[PDB]
Amino acid sequence: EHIPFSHTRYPEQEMRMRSQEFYELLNKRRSVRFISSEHVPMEVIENVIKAAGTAPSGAHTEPWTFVVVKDPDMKHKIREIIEEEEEIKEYLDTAPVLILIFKQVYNEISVSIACGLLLAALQNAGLVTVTTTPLNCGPRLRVLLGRPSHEKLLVLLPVGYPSRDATVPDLKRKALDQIMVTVHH
Amino acid sequence: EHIPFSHTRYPEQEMRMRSQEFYELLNKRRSVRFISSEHVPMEVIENVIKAAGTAPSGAHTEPWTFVVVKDPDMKHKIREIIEEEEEIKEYLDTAPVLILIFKQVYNEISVSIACGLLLAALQNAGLVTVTTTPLNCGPRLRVLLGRPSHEKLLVLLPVGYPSRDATVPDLKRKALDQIMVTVHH
Ligand SMILES: Cc1cc2nc3c(=O)[nH]c(=O)nc-3n(C[C@H](O)[C@H](O)[C@H](O)COP(=O)(O)O)c2cc1C
Ligand SMILES: Cc1cc2nc3c(=O)[nH]c(=O)nc-3n(C[C@H](O)[C@H](O)[C@H](O)COP(=O)(O)O)c2cc1C
To answer: Where does the chain bind 3-iodo-L-tyrosine (chains A, B)?
Structure first.
């Protein structure tokens, strides 16, 4: 039932180095809304989802389904439903792969954490996406994709290489001292 | 306002390799509830939080505060409040560092994604933790830590090296085919 935990320890200098380099890698991640049609390796899509499935989960429920859509007709119906919901996105057609992350019904926090692992793994693998959370489209997309009544759409990620002429808005991230507070005394 | 996006592309074989190795790294992550007192480098804690601050966020609000507690007396008061809340955890005292992640009030999904990046960065850096979400203790911990009324506690992570005699429950993760569904046609 309980087993000894096996752990790799690095010297302090190597911990500093590794953590600096991983930060630098992740800092290069941007939401990209111009995604090339070019095919991406399906072993890579598999490996990023396996990475996501490593996440912690409340009561070890692993309450996530990663729904992968490549079919051009289906990706178009997804786009149509999302656009219709206004009621007052070309990358949904152009991206070779869509990943839709459904929570099985602290499941929402567990599944969002898994999506953070997925985002890191895409960056590490040299792919891009834009995080979207079309929660109001959830019921219609669930039905379109034949997902059971116990799943609820959380996140939709179009995945591919960036367009050769992709742009991003010129946003700056907060400095460490704007996000980190140390309690003293 | 908009700038060309700069992107590193790897050959397909290198994408496969990188994504496999990152999965293998993350697969080694376990929730560890036996954390050594041994000091951990503060540059590493900084670098894991910087990594977390890379996350996407709804409307680029970056709505996260990472509250770092090292002080033994304060860590004990945190433990006392959590234990009192039953109403029907020694690692909160033993861990050299606690990180409490507060959301600034899709902020909850954005902040949970940042916590997935934080968990990956801790694993990469050779540190361990156990994800906890003491949401019912949120109001009392907010006051104890002098956090403003616009922050809401989401996640508490005790951080350190694992105990030399740490154990974990013998859980198996789901295989890829248990978490991934491909829509055809
Ligand atoms: C929960 C969440 C929902 C988001 N929804 C959208 C969306 O509906 N449309 C969109 O273009 N971007 C969406 N984004 C992307 C953000 O606009 C983006 O993360 C933010 O502008 C910061 O840019 P960056 O990801 O390049 O750092 C979303 C991000 C989060 C995490
Ligand atoms: C949202 C969330 C809340 C959790 N809360 C607790 C907690 O209250 N106490 C605890 O011991 N573990 C908690 N965990 C850890 C889980 O029990 C753990 O992730 C699960 O058993 C799987 O083990 P693993 O993380 O080693 O893969 C929590 C995990 C998640 C993601």
So the answer is: 59, 86, 89
Which residue ranges make up each domain of chain A? 1-185
Q: What are phi and psi of B85, to 5 degrees?
A: -65, 20
Cα–Cα distance, B53 to A1 (Å, whole number): 36
Query: What single DSSP character describes residue A60?
Result: G
Q: Which chain B residues touch A161 with a CB distance below 8 Å? A: 7, 9
Q: Do B58 and A133 touch (CB under 8 A)?
A: yes
Q: Please state, in angstroms and rounded to a whole number, the distance separating the CA atoms of residues B102 and A109.
A: 13
Note which residues in 18-57 of chain A have CB less than 8 A from chain B.
18-20, 22-23, 26-32, 34, 41, 43-44, 46-56
**What resolution in Å is listed for this PDB structure?**
2.0
DSSP A160: B
For tokens 């700069």, name the residue.
B6
Answer whether B92's CB lies under 8 Å from B158's CB: yes
CATH 3.40.109.10, domain A1-185, yes or no: yes
Q: What does the DSSP 8-state code read for residue A136?
A: G
Contact map slice: B 81-100 vs A, CB within 8 A:
none
